Design a protein around this ligand. Structure first.
Ligand SMILES: CCCCCCCCCCCCCCCCCC(=O)OC[C@H](COP(=O)([O-])OCC(O)COP(=O)([O-])OC[C@@H](COC(=O)CCCCCCCCCCCCCCCCC)OC(=O)CCCCCCCCCCCCCCCCC)OC(=O)CCCCCCCCCCCCCCCCC
Ligand SMILES: CCCCCCCCCCCCCCCCCC(=O)OC[C@H](COP(=O)([O-])OCC[N+](C)(C)C)OC(=O)CCCCCCCCCCCCCCCCC
Ligand SMILES: CCCCCCCCCCCCCCCCCC(=O)OC[C@H](COP(=O)(O)OCCN)OC(=O)CCCCCCCCCCCCCCCCC
Ligand code: SF4
Ligand code: SF4
Ligand code: SF4
Ligand code: SF4
Ligand code: SF4
Ligand SMILES: [K+]
Ligand SMILES: [Zn+2]
Lengths: 176, 114, 206, 143, 145, 38, 94, 154, 94, 386
């Protein structure tokens, strides 16, 4: 099924011809356009007062990465490298060895935040909710080097944001 | 050993195109030095043209020669029409590359590469 | 069966019949005709047949493939003719798609199909740029995607992913320069293939 | 038109007089009056007004001092602590005064804002130990 | 196999066995294939491994506390189809998909066993056997490994 | 019409590869050994 | 369990620290070395051993689907506790 | 003496951070989020950041998208023609360091190989709000400048 | 929402519409930002019997292409001619 | 005389950068030679080093105004090679967000076309609508643009509770926003002077030059892949295909405005016909299992482990799959060699053939018209250069 967007015959009766001459000489359709912009002048603007007001986001939002812990304080990550395998940008670098207590834990966990595409595949792949993308999006820096996160930075991000991260996961985990 | 030609049916036909392309490049160099305000001289530019031609002097396949001329003409068209910029022209001279060691001892000192 | 893609035997039969039709009319050029299990018709032809076959498919009243959807190439280094040229055509009259494939190597040119489809102009420039296949009698054959002065044909399987050179700005010469590529982090090659066969239906004879 | 002017006057009174009214005008470029939802431990004050359209219905008046930094004029979004970050960005409807976050012993008690460009900025380094151990020659001339 | 489970019960769990510093045993992963038993008896000529118990409780091991320290012992890591027997030195250090394989030769003796050297990011991660029917078949000695 | 070429096929000059990565490289042609772990 | 080396640089939970003659510690001059202070190895050691009745116990890390894959732990050995391979919690048969 | 130089620095710093005219290099998808920062919800004009600015009238360059080798000389040329003071904001992973295309043969692995960068805005793309946070962060960087203080002590 | 009645009339007259009925700014008609938890359904392969994977294995039902002609009567078209489209009855002409 | 157009306008623009080398005689344009590749990022080569899942985000970044539509095209191609079928609810979600994406694209196409011609104001009004649609993207995927939401097998997650109500509230008011846009442009004599009889292309030429989408329908060709070669559940919704009569910029503008109205009409049916059920194919050898299953069932954990490391293997074969993307026919020629990584992935960008026709369409026009013709083609150089 189709329709014509511009297949109309203008009437050639005198009344219709004089309607078009009036539009040509008196700029009626231009005046109409001025009416529309005038009405907007008197509308409330859509602008918000950033940084005092913020754009709305959802629990699923993919922001700055963080490494999480169990309630006891033990790290969740057990160096399985599923996140490193799936990462589409090869942004993750991991090394691991047996910890002094025998645990399977990483000795390196780097995310090059300038390689990362913020896709969230790592947190999908993680089997123990260890690597997540947090809600923070205001972490721009003055140097490139500050965006090459190592494990200490990511663990500090986890300890910094866990209060929000845990609530957001509580809100969305039944959709996963 | 029966193949579809590109342009030239034998080496003699192919070498005619090579000489025609060299003529065009040879005459273009003075204009290139002026248009791009290059700090190199016309002699340096023409020496570069000779070096690029010489490195392929050992070819004996007329089809390979045709492709080399096809590519050389494309490169000339980029230069004449000023689709290239100054950086593209100067990429033939590798000015910021430090000379790499040639003899066995120099290579031995600096790494494992042959 | 909810998870399995349903078959369409009617279209498989129609495309098979039209495949024989084309082979009967162009025996000088047609080498193979196949219909995939998801109902796509491919005509494999000798490279000399590009213009006759494409012209026939465009102009024949039972074909009318007036629209060139896509023209591309595939590099298979193990083949004597490593390059496979693929034409994806569309017929609005018969609401159908056909695929025409031929082959070439590094030194053998292919006839330009610009006379049949004006759409081919840039597609062939891209194939020349990315694969180094030369198209004879092309009005304006030159690179289209790569940088000026770029050496090599990046879509060849033996061209390295990161190339051979990289750019930076150099203050001493006050311009962007090109130097041999060095990576702070080498791309990490992964061996993913399972050592166990997945699809018995495609097993090749020993 | 007179009722609009009254609401204009109400905002001056609603910000504790002219001095408080001018302070918020110059700090926040906004003189609206909202309901106080709560104040965090750093001094940020959170307000809501659900008659405003979505986006302007919640806001924070940043504290004038945080972690030893004078933030009277210099404020930024990283000053909002995580428990309020969720409410302010409408990721949830309940503020931390009604749905407090779960307490864990490892969670930062003190939020930190973006520290880039300061002496507390993050500096990357390799967290792994040396791989290849070199032979140490004997410290005696037995040769 | 299928793509899902219909097992609604609790799982079995078995205690681990210490058999030396080279082979770590996580015997809950064992699928009772008896490859290690047959290798130890036939290839290595050491009748130390067997099965104790019966039925679902059948357990592969040594029964008593014993070490399987033979010059060919490390080969049971390769033949164990599962992660029940794993290299202790290698533990947790790498995943297979990320290693680069260099096919090379062993120089620890004069046999010349064919090996694969697994490397990652410029580091040697482990040594594996490489099949060669006329030399080492598909085994290596523990010094080589 | 076809021509006759008896030269050995060589495309080194038209591949764009730097000379260093043609003349000093050693290619290894092999069938990969089975991963002994599987 | 942070500790400072003789030069004053903190050692991380992975044991990393630039040695005396390592120029690379120049990157921290005028800035700082990011070190997480909550060493997981020390925190998991503070958890009490859980006393259970059965020979076999299961752990999923707590929180149901928000924990780790559920594994079963054998507690027959009396010389040691059963340790969860995911979260490090310890169990003992009473 | 020092008091007069201190206040003059404040005045000129205030004027410059209050009138930041950006030249946007809309290279790829990051430019879309840049347009949303100009759109009504954020209205960067309300901070004094004008919508339409000519490269020769610009104070800040925003690199919003992937920088290819083919494009790198042209970007440098525009930067070189910018009158000073001039600042560069790198927006998004591609501009920051190559991003998804880091290992491509045709891509510059970060625009900071071509021009000095003042602010790196992370994300793929950064949200319009994250970009606005970065611009506000550049303003506070300008606020900390002490050009006349340094000159006085020369 | 809070425009004076006079301003509502002015912008309604200037635009020629009833703007107040379709404001572009969102108020309280939108969904709550906290929702009750979902309980999502499971697919048709979630069964305890009569569910052998080999009966629902789409990947293994794919076959190599049928070879119609290899170099190893009525005419036909690739499909029947397409049927002429019908004019919209909802609104044929704009 | 020879002249080079600037890379981009002096206001924010998100189409990419173009080097247009032109030959002029007086006011008239005699030759147009677009020089592209300024956003060539070797996407097609990078995909060969990715698993099928890892390559999916690359399609968000092609026509980065039509993200989920590009995801749909790639997903359909892999589903065809896999010989599997996404569940009905996922198909409805894909059509629903496909049309929301069409609205996103057509706002950008129409309003930036106007903005470059000098009509700045509509861009601001309609980008507030785009901002609200970005919120729908963010609520289903967590990202405003590059959602990576539509995947082979279905979609990544089910709609959150309350989302469909919000999509209804948005859709309820959108036609009024279109009307305001038409009030500014449709009957404006300046707008008509800039577009009417500009860039005329005949039906015959449009076909031979490889055009698609509105570039065909503006010339009267009755063709739309959603009608003629339907995919997902497009055969279950009612809508009209707008057709032009003059084949010029003005008719193509009218076609795009009317297509926005039809997209609202389709969205309305999607909101009412949304079925219950799972949102990705119930085959764990293709689609990963639910997280609760992965943490409880041995089979689920294995399949989760393998799908996120090796990825699923795709049977060997080649397909050309195309959709009616907002900019035209968007297709992929996808070659599988039997492994978990594609052997070759050629991307057919509708703007590639459209831009190749710029020289043909600009003949006999003035310099200022070249801007109008580029706008009417709706060119984004992520898909042109790839
Ligand atoms: C030179 C001329 C300028 C100097 C003369 C100054 C004129 C008086 C201006 C006083 C405005 C104060 C409004 C107010 O109380 O703030 C409410 C506000 C709180 O009210 P609210 O809760 O947001 O509700 C507002 C309405 O609901 C939502 O807003 P609203 O639009 O629905 O109603 C607001 C009200 C505001 O109207 C006015 O007060 C100004 C009327 C004079 C117009 C001058 C032109 O508008 C009306 O009532 C309409 C009648 C006024 C005449 C409108 C004629 C329009 C043109 C006719 C069509 C022709 C087009 C061509 O408080 C403030 O924020 C105060 C901010 C002060 C801003 C500065 C205003 C002074 C202007 C500068 C003076 C010189 C220095
Ligand atoms: C010619 C006369 C020039 C008059 C100078 C006007 C300075 C006004 C001003 O600085 O605003 C207060 C400014 C406003 O502070 P601000 O610009 O840092 O931030 C205000 C708060 N936000 C941005 C969140 C809205 O106060 C200052 O920051 C001190 C700078 C004083 C500059 C004057 C030098 C004397
Ligand atoms: C300016 C403020 C906005 C006014 C509101 C716009 C409006 O209502 O005008 C629309 C009206 C109808 O015109 P139109 O729809 O184009 O149909 C052809 C003519 N009936 O068109 C008009 O009636 C406009 C008449 C304009 C009269 C000429 C003005 C000349 C100015 C110099 C005196
Ligand atoms: S978000 Fe995506 S690109 Fe970034 S680290 Fe995770 S998997 Fe890699
Ligand atoms: S973060 Fe998760 S997926 Fe990545 S290595 Fe650790 S446990 Fe595995
Ligand atoms: S080889 Fe491994 S799986 Fe087989 S019986 Fe021995 S320990 Fe068990
Ligand atoms: S990797 Fe193999 S042996 Fe190890 S737990 Fe998984 S299925 Fe068992
Ligand atoms: S960083 Fe992401 S959004 Fe920005 S240009 Fe690159 S791919 Fe596009
Ligand atoms: K093993
Ligand atoms: Zn546990």
């Amino acid at each position: 099924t189709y329709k014509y967007v511009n297949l109309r015959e203008p009437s050639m009766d005198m009344k219709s011809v004089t309607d078009r001459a009036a539009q040509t000489l008196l700029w009626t359709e231009l005046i109409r356009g001025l009416g529309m912009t005038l009405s907007y002048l008197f509308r409330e603007p859509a602008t918000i007062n950033y940084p005092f007001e913020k754009g709305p986001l959802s629990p699923r939002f993919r922001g700055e990465h963080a490494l999480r812990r169990y309630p006891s304080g033990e790290e969740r990550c057990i160096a399985c490298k599923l996140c490193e395998a799936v990462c589409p940008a090869q942004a993750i670098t991991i090394e691991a060895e047996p910890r002094a207590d025998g645990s399977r834990r990483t000795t390196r966990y780097d995310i090059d935040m300038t390689k990362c595409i913020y896709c969230g595949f790592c947190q999908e792949a993680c089997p123990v909710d260890a690597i997540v993308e947090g809600p923070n999006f205001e972490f721009s820096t003055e140097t490139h080097e500050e965006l090459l996160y190592n494990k200490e930075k990511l663990l500090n991000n986890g300890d910094k944001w866990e209060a929000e991260i845990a609530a957001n996961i509580q809100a969305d985990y039944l959709y996963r | 050993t029966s193949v579809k030609p590109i342009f030239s049916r034998d080496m003699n036909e192919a070498k005619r195109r090579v000489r025609e392309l060299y003529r065009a490049w040879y005459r273009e160099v003075p204009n290139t030095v002026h248009l791009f305000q290059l700090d190199i001289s016309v002699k340096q530019g023409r020496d570069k043209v000779r070096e690029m031609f010489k490195k392929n002097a050992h070819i004996t396949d007329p089809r390979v020669v045709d492709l080399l001329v096809i590519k050389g003409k494309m490169e000339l068209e980029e230069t004449i029409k000023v689709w290239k910029q100054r950086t593209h022209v100067m990429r033939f001279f590798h000015e910021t590359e430090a000379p790499r060691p040639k003899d066995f001892l120099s290579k031995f000192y600096v790494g494992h590469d042959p | 069966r909810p998870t399995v893609r349903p078959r369409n035997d009617v279209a498989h039969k129609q495309l098979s019949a039209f495949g024989e039709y084309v082979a009967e009319i162009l025996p000088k050029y047609v080498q193979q005709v196949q219909v995939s299990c998801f109902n796509e018709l491919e005509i494999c032809i000798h490279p000399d047949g590009v213009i006759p076959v494409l012209t026939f498919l465009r102009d024949h009243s039972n074909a009318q493939f007036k629209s060139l959807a896509d023209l591309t190439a595939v590099d298979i280094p193990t083949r004597q003719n490593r390059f496979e040229i693929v034409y994806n055509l569309l017929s609005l009259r018969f609401n159908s798609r056909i695929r025409v494939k031929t082959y070439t190597d590094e030194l053998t040119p292919i006839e330009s199909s610009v006379p049949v489809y004006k759409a081919a102009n840039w597609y062939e420039r891209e194939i020349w740029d990315m694969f180094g296949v030369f198209f004879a009698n092309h009005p304006d054959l030159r690179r289209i995607l790569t940088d000026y002065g770029f050496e090599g044909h990046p879509f060849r399987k033996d061209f390295p992913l990161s190339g051979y050179v990289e750019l930076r700005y150099d203050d001493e010469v006050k311009r962007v320069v090109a130097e041999p590529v060095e990576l702070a982090q080498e791309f990490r090659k992964f061996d993913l293939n399972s050592p166990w066969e997945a699809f018995p239906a495609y097993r090749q004879p020993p | 038109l007179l009722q609009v002017l009254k609401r204009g006057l109400q905002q001056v009174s609603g910000h504790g007089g002219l001095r408080g009214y001018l302070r918020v005008l110059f700090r926040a470029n906004d003189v609206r009056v909202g309901t106080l939802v709560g104040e965090d431990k750093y001094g940020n004050k959170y307000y809501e007004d659900n008659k405003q359209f979505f986006g302007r219905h919640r806001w924070v008046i940043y504290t004038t001092e945080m972690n030893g930094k004078n933030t009277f004029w210099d404020v930024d979004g990283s000053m909002v602590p995580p428990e309020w970050h969720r409410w302010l960005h409408c990721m949830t409807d309940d503020p931390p005064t009604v749905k407090p976050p779960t307490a864990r012993k490892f969670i930062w008690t003190n939020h930190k804002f973006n520290l880039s460009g300061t002496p507390q900025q993050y500096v990357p380094y390799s967290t792994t130990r040396k791989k290849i151990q070199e032979w140490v020659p004997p410290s005696t001339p037995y040769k | 196999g299928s793509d899902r489970s219909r097992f609604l019960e609790g799982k079995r769990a078995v205690e681990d066995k210490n058999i030396g510093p080279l082979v770590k045993t996580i015997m809950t992963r064992c699928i009772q294939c008896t490859r290690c038993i047959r290798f130890a008896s036939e290839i290595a000529g050491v009748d130390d491994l067997g099965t104790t118990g019966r039925g679902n409780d059948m357990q592969v091991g040594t029964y008593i506390e014993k070490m399987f320290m033979s010059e060919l012992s490390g080969n049971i890591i390769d033949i164990c189809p599962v992660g029940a027997l794993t290299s202790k030195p290698y533990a947790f250090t790498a995943r297979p998909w990320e290693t680069r394989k260099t096919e090379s030769i062993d120089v620890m003796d004069a046999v010349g066993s064919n090996i694969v050297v697994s490397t990652r990011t410029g580091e040697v991660m482990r040594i594996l056997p490489r099949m060669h029917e006329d030399i080492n078949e598909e085994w290596i000695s523990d010094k080589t490994r | 019409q076809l021509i006759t070429v008896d030269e050995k096929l060589d495309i080194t000059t038209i591949t764009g590869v730097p000379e260093e990565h043609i003349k000093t490289r050693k290619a290894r042609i092999f069938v990969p050994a089975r991963n002994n772990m599987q | 369990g942070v500790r400072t080396s003789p030069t004053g640089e903190k050692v991380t939970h992975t044991g990393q620290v630039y040695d005396d003659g390592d120029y690379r510690k120049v990157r921290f001059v005028g800035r700082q070395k990011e070190v997480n202070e909550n060493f997981a190895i020390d925190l998991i050691a503070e958890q009490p051993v859980s006393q259970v009745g059965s020979r076999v116990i299961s752990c999923d890390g707590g929180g149901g689907a928000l924990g780790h894959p559920r594994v079963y732990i054998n507690l027959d050995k009396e010389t040691k506790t059963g340790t969860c391979g995911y979260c490090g919690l310890q169990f003992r048969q009473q | 003496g020092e008091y007069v130089v201190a206040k003059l620095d404040d005045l000129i710093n205030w004027a410059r951070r209050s009138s930041l005219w950006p030249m946007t290099f809309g290279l790829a998808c990051c430019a879309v989020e840049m347009m949303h920062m100009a759109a009504p919800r954020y209205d960067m004009d309300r901070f004094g950041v004008v919508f339409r600015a000519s490269p020769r009238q610009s104070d800040v360059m925003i690199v919003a998208g992937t920088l290819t080798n083919k494009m790198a000389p042209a970007l440098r040329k525009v930067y070189d023609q910018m009158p000073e003071p001039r600042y560069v904001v790198s927006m998004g992973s591609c501009a920051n360091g190559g991003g998804y295309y880091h290992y491509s043969y045709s891509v510059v692995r970060g625009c900071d190989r071509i021009v000095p960068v003042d602010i790196y805005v992370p994300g793929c793309p950064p949200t319009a709000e994250a970009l606005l946070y970065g611009i506000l962060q550049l303003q506070k960087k300008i606020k900390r400048e002490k050009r006349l203080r340094i000159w006085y002590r020369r | 929402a809070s425009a004076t009645r006079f301003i509502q009339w002015l912008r309604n007259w200037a635009s020629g519409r009833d703007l107040q009925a379709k404001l572009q700014l969102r108020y309280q008609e939108i969904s709550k930002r906290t929702q009750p938890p979902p309980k999502l359904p499971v697919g048709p392969s979630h069964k305890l019997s009569n569910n052998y994977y080999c009966t629902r294995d789409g990947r293994r039902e794919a076959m190599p292409p049928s070879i119609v002609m290899s170099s190893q009567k009525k005419a036909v078209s690739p499909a029947p001619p397409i049927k002429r489209w019908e004019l919209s009855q909802d609104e044929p002409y704009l | 005389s020879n002249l080079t157009l600037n890379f981009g306008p002096q206001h924010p623009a998100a189409h990419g950068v173009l080097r247009l080398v032109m030959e002029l005689s007086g006011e008239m344009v005699r030759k147009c030679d677009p020089h592209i590749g300024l956003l060539h990022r070797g996407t097609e080569k990078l995909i060969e080093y990715k698993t099928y899942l890892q390559a999916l985000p690359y399609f968000d970044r092609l026509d980065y105004v039509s993200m989920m539509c590009n995801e749909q095209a790639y997903s359909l191609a892999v589903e065809k090679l896999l010989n599997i079928r996404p569940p009905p609810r996922a198909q409805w979600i894909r059509v629903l967000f496909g049309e929301i994406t069409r609205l996103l694209n057509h706002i950008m196409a129409v309003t930036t076309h106007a903005l470059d011609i000098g009509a700045m104001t509509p861009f601001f009004w309609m980008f507030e609508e785009r901002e609200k649609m970005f919120e729908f993207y963010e609520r289903v995927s967590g990202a405003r643009m590059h959602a990576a939401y539509v995947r082979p097998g279905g979609v990544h997650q089910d709609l959150p509770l309350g989302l469909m109500d919000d999509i209804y509230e948005f859709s309820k008011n959108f036609s009024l926003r279109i009307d305001e846009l038409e009030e500014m442009l449709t009957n404006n004599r300046i707008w008509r002077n800039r577009t009417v009889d500009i860039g005329i292309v005949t039906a015959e030429d449009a076909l031979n030059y490889g055009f698609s989408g509105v570039m065909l329908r503006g010339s009267g060709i009755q063709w739309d892949l959603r009608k003629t070669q339907p995919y997902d559940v497009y055969d279950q919704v009612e809508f009209d295909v707008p057709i032009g009569s003059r084949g010029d910029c003005y008719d193509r503008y009218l076609c795009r405005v009317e297509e926005m109205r039809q997209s609202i009409r389709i969205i309305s049916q999607c909101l009412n016909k949304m079925p219950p059920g799972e949102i990705k194919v119930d085959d764990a050898k293709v689609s990963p299992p639910k997280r609760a299953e992965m943490k409880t069932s041995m089979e689920s954990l294995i399949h989760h482990f393998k799908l996120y490391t090796e990825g699923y293997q795709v049977p060997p074969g080649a397909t050309y799959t195309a959709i009616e993307a907002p900019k035209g026919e968007f297709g992929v020629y996808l070659v599988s060699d039997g492994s978990s990584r594609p052997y070759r992935c050629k991307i057919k960008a509708p703007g590639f053939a459209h831009l190749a026709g710029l020289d043909k369409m600009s003949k006999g026009h003035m310099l200022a018209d070249v801007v109008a013709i580029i706008g009417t083609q709706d060119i984004v150089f992520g898909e042109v250069d790839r």
